[PDB]
RNA sequence: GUGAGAUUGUGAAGGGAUCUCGCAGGUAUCGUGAGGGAAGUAUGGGGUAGUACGAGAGGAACUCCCAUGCCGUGCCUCUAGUUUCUGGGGUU
């Protein structure tokens, strides 16, 4: 109940399984997605996720003081490409998350690399330490 | 009444009677709408508002906008997928 009807439909990505990266240094090196905030049920199809969404995940490669237990994400880059309302298509070279708390600041300090305009704005501590947005 | 046929079990040319139905519709377009089917359903955000209420802790809602999930009917401008146009090229 808290991003969902914020930011306009973007092609979904990231499905239950997905493995994707910690831009956070957190000292994790992963994520994996267990499942996605906003799914409302559909039979036989999964939770899958996009650039704003806030997802559940386990790290999976990383440091043991935060390995084994569910922890919440925000999608900031994903490969596949969604189309913006100014006609533009766009996509990013690799998938990242990066970890935040059940009300969204950021855990760590600074991201690897980009992020989007879509997880930015609804993110104000993602949009801070991020490098550009893009 | 008028047209058209048939009377095919024992040879042939004749022409009598009788039975069967044909005697008005065909073609083309625009509509009617009985009856039957039957569909859209949910959500979050904004502000209202940190207001109502309350000792405090806490903590609403409607109009009104903005989006979204599930579904439905399509579509191919874009993006993606597909190539036996074996199209052009490359390579063993
Ligand atoms: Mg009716």
């Given at each position: 109940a808290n991003v969902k009807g914020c930011r306009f439909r973007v092609s979904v990505?990231?499905?239950?399984?997905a493995v994707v990266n910690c831009?956070?240094?957190?000292?994790?090196?992963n994520l994996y997605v267990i499942s996605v905030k906003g799914y409302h049920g559909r039979l036989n199809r999964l939770p899958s996720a996009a650039l704003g969404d806030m997802v559940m995940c386990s790290v999976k490669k990383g440091k043991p003081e935060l390995r084994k237990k569910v922890l919440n994400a925000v999608i900031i880059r994903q490969r596949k490409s969604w189309r913006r309302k100014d006609g533009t298509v766009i996509y990013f070279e690799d998938n990242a998350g990066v970890i935040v708390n059940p009300?969204?600041?950021?855990?760590?300090?600074?991201?690897?690399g980009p992020v989007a305009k879509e997880s930015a704005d609804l993110w104000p501590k993602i949009s801070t330490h991020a490098p550009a947005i893009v």
């Open positions: 990505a990231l499905p239950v399984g831009a956070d240094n957190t000292g994790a090196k009300k969204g600041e950021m855990k760590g300090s600074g991201i690897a």
